[PDB]
Design an enzyme around this catalytic site. Sequence first.
Site, PDB file in Angstrom:
ATOM      1  CB  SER A  91      -0.957   0.133   1.244  1.00  0.00           C
ATOM      2  OG  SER A  91      -1.543   1.357   1.418  1.00  0.00           O
ATOM      3  N   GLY A  92       0.637   2.229  -1.018  1.00  0.00           N
ATOM      4  CA  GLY A  92       1.386   3.422  -0.973  1.00  0.00           C
ATOM      5  C   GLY A  92       0.804   4.292   0.262  1.00  0.00           C
ATOM      6  CG  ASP A 153      -0.486   2.582  -4.180  1.00  0.00           C
ATOM      7  OD1 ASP A 153      -0.414   3.077  -5.586  1.00  0.00           O
ATOM      8  OD2 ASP A 153      -1.040   2.607  -3.208  1.00  0.00           O
ATOM      9  CG  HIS A 180      -2.045  -0.454  -7.911  1.00  0.00           C
ATOM     10  ND1 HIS A 180      -1.897  -1.197  -6.639  1.00  0.00           N
ATOM     11  CD2 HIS A 180      -2.403   0.595  -7.335  1.00  0.00           C
ATOM     12  CE1 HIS A 180      -2.128  -0.321  -5.592  1.00  0.00           C
ATOM     13  NE2 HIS A 180      -2.295   0.828  -6.012  1.00  0.00           N
ATOM     14  CB  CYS A 191      -6.649   7.840   0.115  1.00  0.00           C
ATOM     15  SG  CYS A 191      -7.739   6.750   0.674  1.00  0.00           S
ATOM     16  N   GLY A 192      -8.223   6.625  -2.668  1.00  0.00           N
ATOM     17  CA  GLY A 192      -9.495   6.408  -3.504  1.00  0.00           C
ATOM     18  C   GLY A 192     -10.631   7.021  -2.568  1.00  0.00           C
ATOM     19  CG  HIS A 193     -11.978   4.543   0.071  1.00  0.00           C
ATOM     20  ND1 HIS A 193     -11.209   3.724  -0.048  1.00  0.00           N
ATOM     21  CD2 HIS A 193     -13.104   4.383  -0.820  1.00  0.00           C
ATOM     22  CE1 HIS A 193     -11.525   2.682  -0.930  1.00  0.00           C
ATOM     23  NE2 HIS A 193     -12.570   3.218  -1.523  1.00  0.00           N
ATOM     24  NE  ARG A 228      -7.186   4.209  -7.222  1.00  0.00           N
ATOM     25  CZ  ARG A 228      -6.896   4.225  -5.985  1.00  0.00           C
ATOM     26  NH1 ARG A 228      -6.029   3.600  -5.171  1.00  0.00           N
ATOM     27  NH2 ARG A 228      -7.106   5.606  -5.530  1.00  0.00           N
ATOM     28  CB  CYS A 314     -11.456  -5.851   1.176  1.00  0.00           C
ATOM     29  SG  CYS A 314     -12.066  -6.979  -0.009  1.00  0.00           S
ATOM     30  CB  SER A 315     -10.921   0.482   1.446  1.00  0.00           C
ATOM     31  OG  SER A 315     -10.284   1.379   2.217  1.00  0.00           O
ATOM     32  N   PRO A 316     -10.220  -0.556   4.288  1.00  0.00           N
ATOM     33  CG  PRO A 316      -8.509  -1.368   5.647  1.00  0.00           C
ATOM     34  CD  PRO A 316      -8.706  -1.227   4.395  1.00  0.00           C
ATOM     35  CB  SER A 317     -11.215   3.982   3.642  1.00  0.00           C
ATOM     36  OG  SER A 317     -10.175   4.375   3.713  1.00  0.00           O
ATOM     37  CB  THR A 347      -5.415  -0.732   0.945  1.00  0.00           C
ATOM     38  OG1 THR A 347      -6.790  -0.500   1.605  1.00  0.00           O
ATOM     39  CG2 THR A 347      -5.751  -0.797  -0.365  1.00  0.00           C
TER      40      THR A 347
HETATM   41 MG   LIG Z   1      -2.956   3.680  -2.808  1.00  0.00          MG
END
Ligand SMILES: [Mg+2]
Lengths: 427, 427, 427, 427
Positions: A91-92, A153, A180, A191-193, A228, A314-317, A347
Amino acid sequence: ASVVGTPKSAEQIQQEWDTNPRWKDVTRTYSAEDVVALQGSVVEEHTLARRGAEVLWEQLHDLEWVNALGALTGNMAVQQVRAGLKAIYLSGWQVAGDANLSGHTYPDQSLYPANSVPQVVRRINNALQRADQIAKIEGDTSVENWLAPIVADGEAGFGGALNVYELQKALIAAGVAGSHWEDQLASEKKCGHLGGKVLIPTQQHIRTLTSARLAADVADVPTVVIARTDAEAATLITSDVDERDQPFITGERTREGFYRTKNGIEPCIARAKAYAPFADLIWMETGTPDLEAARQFSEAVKAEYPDQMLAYNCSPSFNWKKHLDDATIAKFQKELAAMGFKFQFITLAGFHALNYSMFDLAYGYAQNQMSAYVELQEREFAAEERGYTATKHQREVGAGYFDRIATTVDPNSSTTALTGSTEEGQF
Amino acid sequence: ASVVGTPKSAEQIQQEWDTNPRWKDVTRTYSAEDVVALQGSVVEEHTLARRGAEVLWEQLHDLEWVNALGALTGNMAVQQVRAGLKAIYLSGWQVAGDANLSGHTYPDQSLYPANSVPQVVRRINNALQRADQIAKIEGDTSVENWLAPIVADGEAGFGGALNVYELQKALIAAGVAGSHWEDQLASEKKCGHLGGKVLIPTQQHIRTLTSARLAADVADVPTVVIARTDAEAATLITSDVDERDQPFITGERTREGFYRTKNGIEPCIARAKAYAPFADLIWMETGTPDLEAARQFSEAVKAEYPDQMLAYNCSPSFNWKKHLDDATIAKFQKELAAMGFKFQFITLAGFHALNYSMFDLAYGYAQNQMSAYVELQEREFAAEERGYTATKHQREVGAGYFDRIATTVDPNSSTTALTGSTEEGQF
Amino acid sequence: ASVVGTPKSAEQIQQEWDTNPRWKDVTRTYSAEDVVALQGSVVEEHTLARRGAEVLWEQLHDLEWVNALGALTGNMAVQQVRAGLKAIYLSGWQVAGDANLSGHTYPDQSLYPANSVPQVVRRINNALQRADQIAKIEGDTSVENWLAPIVADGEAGFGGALNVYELQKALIAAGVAGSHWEDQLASEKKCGHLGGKVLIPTQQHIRTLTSARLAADVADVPTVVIARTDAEAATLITSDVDERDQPFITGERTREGFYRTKNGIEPCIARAKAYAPFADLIWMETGTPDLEAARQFSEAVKAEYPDQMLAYNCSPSFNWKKHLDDATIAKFQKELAAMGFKFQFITLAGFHALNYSMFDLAYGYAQNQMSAYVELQEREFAAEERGYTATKHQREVGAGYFDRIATTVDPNSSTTALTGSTEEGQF
Amino acid sequence: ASVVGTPKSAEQIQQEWDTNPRWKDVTRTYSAEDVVALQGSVVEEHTLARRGAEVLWEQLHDLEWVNALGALTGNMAVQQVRAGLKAIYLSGWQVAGDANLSGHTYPDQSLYPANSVPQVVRRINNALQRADQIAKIEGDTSVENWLAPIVADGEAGFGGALNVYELQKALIAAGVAGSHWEDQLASEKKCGHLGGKVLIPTQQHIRTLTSARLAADVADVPTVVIARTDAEAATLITSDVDERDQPFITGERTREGFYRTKNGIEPCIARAKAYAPFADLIWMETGTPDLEAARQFSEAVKAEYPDQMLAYNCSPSFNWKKHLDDATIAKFQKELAAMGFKFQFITLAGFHALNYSMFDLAYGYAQNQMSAYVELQEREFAAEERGYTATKHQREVGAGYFDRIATTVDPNSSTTALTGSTEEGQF
Ligand SMILES: [Mg+2]
Ligand SMILES: [Mg+2]
Ligand SMILES: [Mg+2]
Ligand SMILES: [Mg+2]
């Protein structure tokens, strides 16, 4: 002059591209000749990157699905493989928060030095290699393959196509199996979230995916390239130059010069199809863990690329129980695998496992001193029946392997480590 | 030219040595003028080293005792402080195993690059600083001092007196509060609980301790200096040159030329007394966690140096329940504290917490996928009553803080991160 | 807690901004309270950054002009100072080609890790501090200030406003006196004399200058902020969103979505005026070394900002004699200084001196073995009448300084270095 | 699991040691089975280390002699190769002084982090690779082998046999061809021409040479192992345990416990003979460049090991003209070669060329500004007839190579660098 490392001929490359099933659905907009031209007269062999990429690919086709947990330290990756996992996710986001070359703690906005993830890939590989060396001298066959493939990442590439190129090349030198790349503006990466995302034109991301495959080909390794898309939540794009993007442009512009764009699964599906010829796995970030939305995406994309493998975060976000009930949580990954999500990963698994376990130990230690630590040591002992080996920490970090080196050099050395140690005498 | 960073005069320095109680029992075999000679015409201020050393010395005198846990990542230290601890221990064993500049996993034998611990000291301070910065904009007063003092491992100095000097200077530049140094042959250094240890002559360690003090004076910070002795278990010494060591020399030699020596608490007490005038705290490694043996060492030393503070290693290298009953384990630190052991620490706390937590999560993930991660997340939500804050990982790593920076540069930026994040909408 | 490093109150800051002549022409779009909000509860003192910034400011107003050569190694800087120069220039171009953290050789396109220049700033400062420590023990007063101020390349910020902020912060922690920032798209950044350049909107660069200033205020040091425009040669811009840029926008566009723009001194003058309230010095890159063009730019700008200091790049990217004759080359800098360019520098000085000197030596060595090296040794001996001191390489790098530390720790040590050395017996 | 990187069988290795002439005079006190036990289940390929070691071995037997100059930056190595040299020397002294990981300037006393030389080895290979890449696209056959073998300084190993092992392993990973190891106590290490040298027992140095061979064998590469002895000038030794050392031990001891020992060519001949079975090359440090003394050492060693190759340090630490006349200086290396010194090098060439070239430039710049630099630039244009190419610095650092990558990714890119560059239009 020598012949060690001499480059293959363009003929040879063209041939592998045409006959290896690995490249069955892979489009390359440059030539075999173009690859050779950039190789100089010596090509370094990247063993771990080759082996890892090959293993990852076979697992993606042989297993019901490949899952992984994010690892930000070598020991974490070792525990993940000891527990039975068969891939490592780097994970970046975790690198920004606790393992980057600036030494600072950062939110996930591409703020750290661009060679940070490559250094952690090298680190994870060194750790797995030490576990592998130790297993050999201990006669431990508890694990089939210690060198689990690492998927890392590459964020938004830290710049243009050339920054993308150098990051891929460095990840490979370090031994990565897959990488990715996302369709965001590097200078505003999120971050995607997180909010505030800015997409770049569909074609620009194709240039990125192209650059990543190119660095992989010039380094002579079959790296798994993952595309992504961040279009499910992003409402900004840097330009309307690409006709595939225009259908979503609203016309509104920001002071920075960005364009507003309509976000959702639709733009994700479109970009996904455009990225498919250039990606071994496709992934769309989403705002909630929802099997239905995941299915929509999967059916839509596979309706055009039946053989396209997908990846899922499966994000912890996500606040998991706020959205799903235990029964669904329990079947979550198996359900996704059925849909074609062959690479699944948590992640931020490491960030939370590390932060929580230390908060928990330290809180107890603040109240009861040694009693709290002893509870942990006992838990470790109890976990031995499960396969856990780190309670005997000296051997875990290689004390026995270096003793072997020492006695190979000097069998009479009077300064070896394990003999007379409390580990040998109390565990 | 300017006056910024103008070195103090020898008189000002002498005055502090002569009148600050901090130097009450500190012997310096060099002079104030010797210090000035080495400073050039500009002296850098080391704010964190100064503040951490000042705070550490105060706590050692103000609290029943100061305890800590080993931390190998910045986030680890943040959790230790969040949970209420008032100092951080930076283990060289942990750096060898999972956090050193070579990227390799190593046993505790001074195999990693000598600037590794200083780098982790810098990382730790950067993380505590971020936590500090975040708590300020969040109006969080739950923690009185985020910048807890760090006590770090100087091992056996990685060489001679000049290597010792450089390590202490680098630890200081990074912001260390205290540093410990052991009487082992650097080239054969071992974890105090590993076998094959080799002591150096008593006077050689006095040179080490003098070197560590001199680098702190030239850097103009009151760093805490800890002297560690490994004579309890060590059966070898490099030379019989020192009359104080001769009493334990047996006459027997090893094929490498080392001298066999009689180990036990007697040699430890003798070295402890010799080191005292050069040590702010004194520590002797032991083969078992024994309150008795500790009292013996303590009284013996205080019998000659009443005000001498001691340090104790509550090591994970001990199988605690194999030697003690829960009653003793529970009173261990309090008891030691009454004996004069003002600094106490669990060296490998981070290695174990990190490895066990990742093994536990991964094993459960390997069997039941998301159910295992959700168990962890619910545990985190549960711990919030205890003060845990990392479940909301975006703000934890500074997303809100960089948002404030972004809005100070341009309050109308359309790319800030927390607004519209899943953290906002789901936690 | 302790009071070391307590931040200044907002009132104190506001006062300095209100009364110190340093902030005379400096616009801050954020408030003093904003700054305090980002400082947490401790502010590290940055001794060399402050001293350097103060000195550079004073020099800019007290000398006819300040010149410099690019330095890529610490010894390079030491020699620059020894020869009498009073500032050091840290080129990013040179860092790319021979001194960055990726270990790779790169063209000047912002491809190396973002923390590379800060590391070189720390390196140069450490080297200068060593030359200063040595001069002291040798009673050498040949140089008044060994800590010449360092002016470093911040390129295009390596991203967005937050990447700029971190780079500035790291430059300051390393001890930089001033930093320069250009109006190019970081992901497409180019050396000023390469083609393929792309500008960013005028307001975006003001955001960059604002961020660079904000980081310096948060760190509490008077860094000199330098603004650079690349509009003389750039024919591309990311967007036509800014009204000040629209007059130069042509309408034509590239497949990447970039906008063609009309280059020349006109856009540079307009940009220079817009940046002026946000820059301590302004610099425009040019295509040839032309005194007329230079005066043209200077008059225009001072026509509106009389006290605005400028900076000029006497780049090796220019074929100097193909443009000018010896008479013009000879007065070049003195003339420019009249025009108001108070900071002038040869960006790639070090790269050329190092590449040429080694090719020359290696060439002669391949032919004549030792004779070629002796020719060099004799030149060094000869140059000693000019002040050169590196022929005696041991003391140059501190053998004598370290001997002093060794003898301070143990006057009787039998392992000091200069005594018995061939340097002491043959030089 | 995969076949990639599978270890060879002990039988295969034994066979290689038994039949490959490479191992003709090489003694290995450990077994092939011992090598295989330490390789785990995957062996990384080290292309550059393999190629370089093979090439260097061939050259040592095919050329009259192999010479080199100390390189401390990648650009220096590039120039050395463009200028005709076929080997590169990587000096630990130059790394201590201007290129080590601590960022500090140090005298030659093993003060810098032990992974410093490996990183410089990787840097040099990277730079040479960039030149190989450029040459290929420019179709330049001016140089037949850009990847010249690198011979690096392993100093005293930074510790015990395990520090030696890791340093050798790291040098190979970075692509080294050969490494040298000296018989000094690491904690008191010195440049061969400084005083204060302390030797270690003859057997201990054999252990070091054995460890260095083992690491190369485990890494599966034929690394050239060089043994250096410092017994010409050292008058101290750590112990008198070794009967081969006892004839020189005087019985007198220093306060640190070191033993005085009689120095000279005699104990160097003795140590060289003892090291011969474990060294591909042997080197003795001398106090002056004396062809007679060289011949004495050479004849004495070859009397027992006629095929033993020797190495010689033409040190800048000697005042050459003060000892030799022009004629001898001119035939110095040719003569040494006839004696069997097949590897000759000027350790500090880079330091001197860099420090002198800059002081000269800076001195002339401080007086005549642009005139001075212009002098340097024409010299560069002049050197083009000799093969110099750096005057055109953009292509020299890969601006054209990256343009190729850029157009391979996107033929229509409007952001390539050389087109429209002042280099293209003015050189
Ligand atoms: Mg990332
Ligand atoms: Mg330790
Ligand atoms: Mg630049
Ligand atoms: Mg050397």
